[PDB]
Structure 1
Amino acid sequence: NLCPFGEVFNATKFPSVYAWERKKISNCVADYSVLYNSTFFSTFKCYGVSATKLNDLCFSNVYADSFVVKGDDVRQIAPGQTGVIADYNYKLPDDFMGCVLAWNTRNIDATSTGNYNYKYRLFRKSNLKPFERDISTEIYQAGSTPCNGVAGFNCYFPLRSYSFRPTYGVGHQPYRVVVLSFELTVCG
């Protein structure tokens, strides 16, 4: 059977980066011609493997991570980054083997009145481990005074929402990212 790559890339709804979702790919044959011979993506950078030799290759299973970040935050979806997205939202291992694909979605993910659905984690105790996922909305305690559930002075809400608008610069417009992880069923 063909692997459902259209179910992740052409998916209508995409999740926030802090609550990124993962989809496992098991027994199916892949067709990477659709993903590689297309100028629709703005970023198409592979790590540990090449963008062409994958056609004659097999893996135990493929994991597809999908989320939405701003244009300038796409550089952090890469091995060895230390930004806010990489530390508190989505971190890749140093020995990552896969490809990161992103494309601009200004017309569907940014509204004139401000699309505040897409969020990200700004404050967190320590960084996330590789492939870790944190959806906790606990009040972040930045000070010594306890917060007791109510955010106040030195007590900030951990999540802040992206503020995507179609008039933003390209660096602040919404970009949908799909990270394909390779683990050693799926062949070319």
Structure 2
Amino acid sequence: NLCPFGEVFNATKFPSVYAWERKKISNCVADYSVLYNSTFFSTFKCYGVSATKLNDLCFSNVYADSFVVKGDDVRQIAPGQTGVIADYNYKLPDDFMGCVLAWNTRNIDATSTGNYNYKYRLFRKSNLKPFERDISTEIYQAGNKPCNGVAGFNCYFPLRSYGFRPTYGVGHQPYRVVVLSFELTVCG
């Protein structure tokens, strides 16, 4: 059977970067011709493997991570980055083997009144491990005095909204990202 790549790429709803979702791909034959022979993507950057030789290859299972970030934050979805998205939202390992695909979604993910649904984590104790996921909304304590669950001075809410609008620059427009991870069932 064909692997359901349309369920992640052509998915109607996409999650926030802080609460990115992962989908496991098990016994099915893959078809990377759809992903490779298309100019719809804005980046499409592969690491550890090539964008063409993958057709005649097999893996134990494939993991598809999906989320939404700004245009300038797409560069952080790569091995060896230290931005806010890479440190507090979604981090890739140094020995990552896969491809990162992103495309502009200004027409569906950005509204005139401001789309504040897509969020991201701005404050967190230490960085995230590779492939770690944090959905905690606990009040971040930046000062020495305790917060006591009520955000205040030196006590900030950990999540902030992107606030996408169609008149923003290309670097601030919403981009849907799909990270395909390869682990060593799935063949071409």
> What band does the TM-score fall into relative to the shorter chain?
over 0.9
Shift of 1:109: 0.1
Shift of 1:13: 0.2
Report SS of the residue matched to 1:55: helix
Report SS of the residue matched to 1:7: helix
CA distance in 1 between partners of 2:157 and 2:53 (Å): 45
CA distance in 2 between partners of 1:55 and 1:21 (Å): 25
* Matched positions, count: 188
Shift of 1:15: 0.2
Cα shift readout 1:121-173 (whole Å, capped 9, x = no counterpart): 00000000000000000000000110000000000000000010000000000
Report SS of the residue matched to 1:85: helix
CA distance in 2 between partners of 1:96 and 1:169 (Å): 30
CA distance in 2 between partners of 1:78 and 1:183 (Å): 17
Structure 1's unaligned 5+ residue stretches are none
Report SS of the residue matched to 2:44: strand
CA distance in 2 between partners of 1:123 and 1:167 (Å): 27
Shift of 1:182: 0.1
Cα shift readout 1:92-140 (whole Å, capped 9, x = no counterpart): 0000000000000000000000000000000000000000000000000
Shift of 1:59: 0.2
Identity of aligned residues (%): 98
CA distance in 1 between partners of 2:26 and 2:144 (Å): 48
Report SS of the residue matched to 1:120: strand
CA distance in 1 between partners of 2:158 and 2:56 (Å): 44
Structure 2's unaligned 5+ residue stretches are none
Shift of 1:10: 0.2
Q: What does residue range 115-130 of structure 1 map to in structure 2 within 5 Å?
A: 115-130=115-130
Shift of 1:78: 0.1
CA distance in 2 between partners of 1:32 and 1:91 (Å): 24
CA distance in 1 between partners of 2:115 and 2:84 (Å): 20
Shift of 1:84: 0.1
Alignment RMSD (CA, Å): 0.3
Please list every run of at least 4 consecutive aligned residues from structure 1 whose deviation after the TM superposition is greater than 4 angstroms: none
CA distance in 2 between partners of 1:145 and 1:154 (Å): 8
Report SS of the residue matched to 1:147: coil
Report SS of the residue matched to 1:43: coil
CA distance in 2 between partners of 1:21 and 1:187 (Å): 23
CA distance in 2 between partners of 1:17 and 1:172 (Å): 15
Report SS of the residue matched to 1:62: strand
